[PDB]
Amino acid sequence: EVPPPGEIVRPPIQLGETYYAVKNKAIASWVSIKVIEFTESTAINGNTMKSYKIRYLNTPYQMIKTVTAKHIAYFEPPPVRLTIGTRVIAYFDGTQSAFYPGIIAEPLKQANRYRYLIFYDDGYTQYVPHRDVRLVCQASEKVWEDVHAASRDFIQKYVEKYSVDRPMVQCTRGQSMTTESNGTWLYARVIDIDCSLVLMQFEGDKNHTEWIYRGSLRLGPVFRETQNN
């Protein structure tokens, strides 16, 4: 169902328990692990810095790594609904299917059919149900500081300078807009709409379609509306 609001708790990581953690690259897939060793280091100043030795589960041979709590996520979905700015891993299926890091961009609500809007670290965006998210075991007070350097500045403006009155493009299927794709500003047509997302098809290829955030500066009209202030 829709979990109720409440306290978003981060219990301490336990020895022998199952979690998710960064497989290799931090912005890539997070997979099943067992916490096999706990490391704690304390300096003359006071800061007690925690580390965790993890064993990757379901592997061809023993694979061990040392990571921080910022690179580990709980195995079960939270018992409460999550809010904007919450650091998560969200399950991407894509019609490779796996857990990738992101930020809750929208909470669960009627207006979005009780789905979280995810802004993945790699720049991808999708609507995911509550059951497909896991809370990251630790986060910075400034959550964009935990986000891959690629989407960092976008997350910072979105979260830190958050406004419900931010420019959002109003569109209908069949309209065309100038749309940015990997450095190039191309011609794109609205194919589908899903609440805060718009499905754009770039003029070059009909198989080149992408779900874009309607408030993204990758859409020319949004960029135009933002320049005029």
């Binding site: 940015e180 500003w185 992408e210 990758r218 960029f223």
Partner: peptide
């Protein structure tokens, strides 16, 4: 594949 969230 993704073009990001910003230009």
């Amino acid at each position: 594949s993704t073009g990001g969230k910003a230009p």
